[PDB]
Write a protein that binds this DNA or RNA. Structure first.
Ligand SMILES: [Mg+2]
Ligand SMILES: [Mg+2]
Ligand SMILES: [Mg+2]
Ligand SMILES: [Mg+2]
Ligand SMILES: [Mg+2]
Ligand SMILES: [Mg+2]
Ligand SMILES: [Mg+2]
Ligand SMILES: [Mg+2]
Ligand SMILES: [Mg+2]
Ligand SMILES: [Mg+2]
Ligand SMILES: [Mg+2]
Ligand SMILES: [Mg+2]
Lengths: 50, 77, 66, 136, 116, 177, 75
RNA sequence: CCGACUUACCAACCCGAUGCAAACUGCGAAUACCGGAGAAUGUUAUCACGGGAGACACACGGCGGGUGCUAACGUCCGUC
RNA sequence: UCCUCCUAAAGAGUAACGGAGGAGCACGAAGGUUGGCUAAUCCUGGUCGGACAUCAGGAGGUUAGUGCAAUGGCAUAAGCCAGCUUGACUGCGAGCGUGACGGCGCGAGCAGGUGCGAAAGCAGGUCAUAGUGAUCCGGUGGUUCUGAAUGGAAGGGCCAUC
RNA sequence: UGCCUGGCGGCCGUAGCGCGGUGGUCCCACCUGACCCCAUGCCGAACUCAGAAGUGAAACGCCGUAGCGCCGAUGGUAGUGUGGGGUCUCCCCAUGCGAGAGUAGGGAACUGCCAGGCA
RNA sequence: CGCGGGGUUGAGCAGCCUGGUAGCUCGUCGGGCUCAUAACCCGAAGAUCGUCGGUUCAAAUCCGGCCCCCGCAACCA
């Protein structure tokens, strides 16, 4: 409800994304996490964009 | 009067394999809510504190510990 | 200590107004001159000098010039 | 009228009344009124049977009441069908088993207590008996 | 109690090595000496033990109970253990921080063929 | 320092012959000095706590630790985690230096000084004292300060009784009654 | 949001004030037409001959859904 | 002002004794249930797959109870 | 509709318009790991300061605490701090538990790539149990799997997701 | 072979608490110093390093003590399976199982693998 | 003891409308004007926002519990 839904789009070029939830009113700031990207088979950085 | 009449579905807890039973690896022994029986030898502890076998054998309940805590252990016999 | 979160600390000469040289470490930045220490404090010499607030019959008698 | 203050739960199950009582001895006083029957004994039958024996001994002597109701008994209103919730609490009763020492008293000659306990046993539904302190 | 806190500081690390069933090399340290013994996964019987109180170790050492003395007993326990065929042990700590004499006790034993 | 080796050379012998001990270290020794104040009025003026911390840093050569409320109490409208007081623990050389510089100059500078009480022990040889104002200490210039905030000195010794604590503190020329 | 009114300024004022007092009026027309429906539902509810009628508008009360009033940014 | 004298008073925490609890437990059965072995007895009485159904309004009695008034040929469960 | 205790008769389950309370969430740290620590409440002493703020000793010992109701649990802490971080990761899964089914749940281990630690090791979200709705119909991103003469394309399919 | 001390367990209060005494040749503890490796949301108090002047005060171990904690019968009592019975909202009989509390009493542990000192 | 609406100064009322100023009209008091009272002019006084707790730095406002008052309902053969 209050926690909106966001997707972390991979930064390896391929189209892949993990979907989570983020409290969208504390301050606007994208999530940066290093998560596995199966298409390229490596641990890359995941910036968020819905 | 009124403002009542609610309950939840029974969770089917309790001991599934009593003492002396031959279990296969990975078979649930007890489904718990807390940790009433602790993990002894050759048994695990899931995220619900479910105690599961880790190598096939005969179950055995024990009371090891300074605090007299129930321990479930398995002998590969 | 924990490497510069503290103030400075150094030896400063703290002597009385009646001699009494006393080298004491402190954090002031300048030597200081003060009153007597407990060595020359007026504590055991004014025990009755402090308890003197009183006397009316004595000052009435001197008024009795007649 | 004896009744608990700040009880944990408002309404209680009916339950059953089987067995023999625990407080079967005269400990605080010297002469007691031991119960012989069985059945709940309410909070008004305690006060009505107490006044009757704090008055038959004038006002002298000590009197101990060794029971307390602590049991809420509900009662459905009149012209109300069944169901639609448990009834509301109306009075408090103290479950009595054969052997319970209900009242006891001290500081009086025996024949005065043996008559004061007779005027209190007439306000109680259950049978009673007069018992005396013993050495044990 | 300065010792009861330490004995309950290492309980979690100690009781995992009973569950894993792995031979452990417990370490005891004192302001004067330092001991090190190899204890079977049974936990009730020992196999190899070396310490700074033995006359064959402390006789050629300046002072027992410092880093270079710890390296003198860490060498000893590794030769005795390898002599009986024990090679794969795990390092206990007994609550001491892995920073000082214990580190040189472990580092020296590690360099002498012991694997952990 | 001076008070420490004075203790070593003289007080050990004096107390040993006074109490007829049998061991060198059966004589009580002072183990720490704690200087604190719970400012209380830092509910709304957090700068007051910083000023008090600066005062304590000036008085004793350490950075004070800011102490927060352990349990929420509704009487003083505070809750858990509110910075309330400041505290400084002195051990060893600094403890002895502050011990010298308190009872040699700061106590004499007390307005209308009469004497410290002797029945102010907690029953285990510990001493406590309230200076009631921070201006007396030589580390203060009487003009930088803005309030009347006072410390709470606590001398913690290894004495086994208030009697032995009294004896130890009177061996150091304390201004008792 | 950005709402555009064709007008110089004195048409905009009489548009954006009239269209707000109209919002309040069309909301009071619901807030006061729920009130007497609730009076009926509260009076003839347990009555056996009019309960089927009270329950007919006790459900049209909750299908009205008055429109909310926001807060002006000017203070 | 300090409390300086007082109070036919109420009274927490602890100490000794006496009771009560479905939603209390520092104790704790009888039965019941799960697993192993062993005789004897039972026209496999056990399980799996497949063809065909009916039934899903139950009643009373004994024991353990909830509701009721420990009332009802009352009502709702467990087992026979 | 879902969660917790009793009724529920010491395995599981067990009804009533029976007795009592909660949910439609929160968190990018309140998760992972490594290192460290132990509470409530009373006594004395003390400056403002009082029955209750902060400080020092003593008793006490988990009567405290757990993001949220109750039950079970917790000192090796599952409670309280700090450093580094993203395992709140992808494909699978022996074997089990619970459902009439739809489904739900526990899970050692295997492969590829990570985090913490010196290392043994731990990490597939949080002390556990609530915080949630099938199918159809459509929206978005990726993939020549298909493409109604052939090459494309529209449209379908598969994976992620609303 | 016996005594003492240290480490790691089995075992878990008959094993813990309190009170009195006792131990420093070795081990252990307190302890000296701190610039150093390392740390204090301040403080070498804790953690850590460099050593030996001193002490056995504190702590710990050992010995004695029942003032507590703890263990705990036999007999009786309650309850209950099966089968009968009663004046059957509660009980009795036959038979099998048999508590809880309490009483008499027990009791301030026992033990294993290593490494030191002493005889 | 089932459902709603309210408690703000001596009286009648807002502000609660998404939290940051205790206000309106009558009224009370002290002066002035008048021969005197009213009217009028000047100055001022008060309340624990029912009570008790809760997140919030801050509550009349948001939340929970209790008290008081005023209304409504408690059906038909
Ligand atoms: Mg049907
Ligand atoms: Mg049916
Ligand atoms: Mg039926
Ligand atoms: Mg019937
Ligand atoms: Mg059950
Ligand atoms: Mg059963
Ligand atoms: Mg958590
Ligand atoms: Mg940890
Ligand atoms: Mg955690
Ligand atoms: Mg939780
Ligand atoms: Mg084509
Ligand atoms: Mg396509």
């Amino acid at each position: 409800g209050i926690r909106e839904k966001i997707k972390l789009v991979s930064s390896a070029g391929t189209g892949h994304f993990y979907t989570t939830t983020k409290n969208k009113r504390t301050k606007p700031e994208k999530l940066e996490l290093k998560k596995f990207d199966p298409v390229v088979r490596q641990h890359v950085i995941y910036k968020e964009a819905k | 009067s009124t403002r009542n009449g609610r309950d939840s579905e029974a969770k089917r807890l309790g001991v599934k394999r009593f003492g002396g039973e031959s279990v296969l690896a990975g078979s649930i022994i007890v489904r718990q809510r807390g940790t009433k029986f602790h993990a002894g030898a050759n048994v695990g502890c899931g995220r619900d504190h479910t105690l599961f076998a880790k190598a096939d054998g005969k179950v055995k309940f024990e009371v090891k510990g300074p605090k007299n805590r129930k321990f479930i252990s398995i002998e590969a016999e | 200590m924990k490497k510069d979160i503290h103030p400075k600390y150094e030896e400063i000469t703290a002597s009385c107004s009646c001699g009494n040289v006393m080298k004491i470490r402190s954090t002031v930045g300048h030597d200081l001159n003060l009153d007597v220490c407990s060595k020359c404090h007026p504590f055991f010499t004014g025990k009755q000098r402090d308890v003197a607030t009183g006397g009316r019959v004595d000052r009435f008698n001197k008024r009795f010039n007649i | 009228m004896l009744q608990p203050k700040r009880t944990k739960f408002r309404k209680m199950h009916k339950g059953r009344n089987r067995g023999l009582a625990q407080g079967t001895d005269v400990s605080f006083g010297s002469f007691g009124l031991k119960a012989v029957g069985r059945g709940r004994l309410t909070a008004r039958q305690i006060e009505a049977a107490r006044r009757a024996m704090t008055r038959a001994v004038k006002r002298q002597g000590k009197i101990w009441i060794r029971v307390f109701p602590d049991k809420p008994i509900t009662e459905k209103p009149l012209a109300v069908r069944m169901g639609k919730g448990k009834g509301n609490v109306e009075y408090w009763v103290a479950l009595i088993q054969p052997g319970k020492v209900l009242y006891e008293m001290d500081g009086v000659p025996e024949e005065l207590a043996r008559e004061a306990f007779k005027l209190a046993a007439a306000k109680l539904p259950i049978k009673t008996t007069f018992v005396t302190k013993t050495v044990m | 109690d300065k010792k009861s806190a330490r004995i309950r500081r290492a309980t979690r690390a100690r009781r995992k090595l009973q569950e894993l069933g792995a031979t452990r090399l417990v370490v005891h340290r004192t302001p004067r000496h330092i001991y090190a013994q190899v204890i079977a996964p049974n936990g009730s019987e020992v196999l190899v033990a070396a310490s700074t109180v033995e006359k064959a170790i402390a006789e050629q050492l300046k002072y027992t109970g410092n880093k270079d003395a710890a390296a003198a007993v860490g060498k000893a326990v590794a030769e005795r253990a390898l002599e009986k065929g024990i090679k794969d042990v795990s390092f206990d700590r007994s609550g001491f921080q892995y920073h000082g004499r214990v580190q040189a006790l472990a580092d020296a034993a590690r360099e002498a063929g012991l694997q952990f | 320092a001076k008070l420490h080796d004075y203790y070593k050379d003289e007080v050990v012998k004096k107390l040993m012959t006074e109490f007829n001990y049998n061991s060198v270290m059966q004589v009580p020794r002072v183990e720490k000095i704690t200087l604190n104040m719970g400012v209380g009025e830092a509910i709304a003026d957090k700068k007051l706590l910083d000023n008090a911390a600066a005062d304590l840093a000036a008085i004793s050569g350490q950075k004070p630790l800011i102490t927060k409320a352990r349990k929420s109490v509704a009487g003083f409208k505070i809750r858990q985690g509110y910075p309330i007081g400041c505290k400084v623990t002195l051990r060893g050389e600094r403890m002895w230096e502050f011990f010298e510089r308190l009872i040699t100059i700061a106590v004499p500078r007390i307005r209308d000084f009469r004497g410290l009480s002797a029945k102010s022990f907690d029953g285990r040889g510990n001493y406590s004292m309230g200076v009631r104002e921070q201006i007396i200490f030589p580390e203060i210039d009487y003009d930088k300060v803005d309030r009347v905030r006072g410390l709470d000195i606590t001398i913690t010794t290894t004495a086994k009784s208030d009697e032995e604590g009294r004896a130890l503190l009177a061996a150091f020329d304390f201004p008792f009654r | 949001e950005l709402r555009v009114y064709p007008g110089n300024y004195d048409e905009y004022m009489t548009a954006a004030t009239q269209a707000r007092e109209r919002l309040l009026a069309d909301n009071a027309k619901k807030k006061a037409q729920i009130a007497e429906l609730q009076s009926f539902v509260s009076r003839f509810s347990a009555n056996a001959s009019k309960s089927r009628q009270a329950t007919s508008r006790a459900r049209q009360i909750d299908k009205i859904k008055l429109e909310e009033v926001k807060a002006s940014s000017r203070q």
